[PDB]
């Protein structure tokens, strides 16, 4: 799904700004 890929692209940058020093994990599957 292309639109799912687009939202995940915005999810990653949102997580990076929110978490910061702690870091984050992204796992679609």
Ligand X SMILES: *C(=O)CCCCCCCCCCCCC
Which spans of this chain sit near Zn ion (rule: CB under 5 A)?
A: 6
Residue located via tokens 């870091």:
23
- Least Å distance, CB 20 to ligand X, is 11
Q: Is the dihedral of CA 12, 13, 19, 22 positive or negative?
A: positive
Q: Give the integer Cα–Cα distance in Å for 27 and 11.
A: 11
User: Which residues lie near a second copy (CB under 8 A)?
Assistant: 2-3, 6-10, 12-17, 19-21, 23-29
User: Which residues lie near another protein (CB under 8 A)?
Assistant: 1-2, 4-5, 7-8, 11, 14-15, 17-20, 22-29
């Amino acid at each position: 799904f292309v639109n799912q890929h687009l939202c995940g692209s915005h999810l990653v940058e949102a997580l990076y700004l929110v978490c910061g020093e702690r870091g984050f994990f992204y796992t679609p599957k």
